[PDB]
From a paper:
pmcAmyotrophic lateral sclerosis/parkinsonism-dementia complex (ALS/PDC or lytico-bodig) is a fatal disease found in the Chamorro population of Guam (1–4), some families on the Kii peninsula of Japan, and the Auyu and Jakai people of New Guinea. We now show that tau filaments from Guam and Kii ALS/PDC adopt the CTE fold in brain and spinal cord. The greater heterogeneity of amyloid filaments, when compared to CTE and SSPE, probably reflects the fact that ALS/PDC is a multiple proteinopathy based on neuropathology, as suggested for cases from the Kii peninsula.
Tau filaments with the CTE fold were present in all cases. The spinal cord from case 2 had only Type II filaments, whereas that from case 3 contained a mixture of Type I and Type II filaments. By cryo-EM, we have shown that tau filaments from AD and CTE each consist of two identical C-shaped protofilaments that comprise residues 306 to 378 (in the numbering of the 441 amino acid tau isoform). They differ by the presence of a hydrophobic cavity in the CTE fold, which encloses a nonproteinaceous density of unknown identity that may be involved in giving rise to this fold. Type I and/or Type II CTE filaments were present in brains and spinal cords.
Residue numbers in the entry:
A (entry chain A), B (entry chain E), C (entry chain B), D (entry chain D), E (entry chain C): 305 to 379
Write the structure that this text describes.
């Protein structure tokens, strides 16, 4: 006979306190961008990105994360 | 005989406190963009992006995340 | 006979306190970008990125993380 | 004969620039106040103030001041 | 004969620049105040202040000041 008892107990805490959060300045690509092109030959796919792209300002008050994985495999 | 008892208990907390959250400035692509092109040959697909694209300001008051996965596999 | 009792107990804490969080300045790509190109031959795929791209300002009040993995494998 | 010519010229500037102004916390009188009084004799005027009074939070974006006085006295 | 020519010229500047201004915490009187009084005789005026009074948080973005006085006195 086989008897499995899976009782994981979790009374955990993930916590943050912040008195104030702010005065955040993100200024990407203030400078001048100049792209001058003459007599170019492309014989395959071209991907081009010019300027200010994909810039992120991420300011969570918390930003706290908990990842928990439980796996019981009987064979 | 096989007896499986799967009783995971979770009394967990993921918490944030923030007194104030703000004064956030995101200014992408303030500068000048100049793209001058002359005599270009393309023989395949072209993807072009010019200017200020896909810029993100993300400011959650919380932004707290919990991921939990439970898997019981009997074979 | 086989008897397995899986009782992990977790009363853990992951905590942060911050009195104030701020006055953060991120200024990527203030300078001038000049790309001058003449008589270029490309016989395969081209990926080009020019300017200020993929710059991140990430300011969580907490940013606290807990990862827990539980695995019971019976064979 | 008396000839007075009063021509003061003022092309002056008083200026401020502020990118962001904020996340200001003023918390006066968080503590407990206990005033226990027994058998007091007052034979003249009494002024009493108890608690949290006359507290100021003053946050001007500018707060710039110019005072100019012109006085011509002929006798 | 008397000839007075009063031509003061002022092309002056008083200037400030601030990228960010903030995360200011003023917490007066967090502690406990206990005033226990027994058998007091006052034969004249009494002024009493107890607790958290007249506390100031002053945060001007500029706060720039110019004082100019002009005085011409003829006798």
């Amino acid at each position: 006979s086989v008897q499995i008892v899976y009782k994981p107990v979790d009374l955990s805490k993930v916590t943050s306190k912040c008195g104030s959060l702010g005065n955040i300045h993100h200024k990407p690509g203030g400078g001048q961008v100049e792209v001058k092109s003459e007599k170019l030959d492309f014989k395959d796919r071209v991907q081009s990105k010019i300027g200010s792209l994909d810039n992120i300002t991420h300011v969570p008050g918390g930003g706290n994360k908990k990842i928990e994985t439980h796996k019981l495999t009987f064979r």
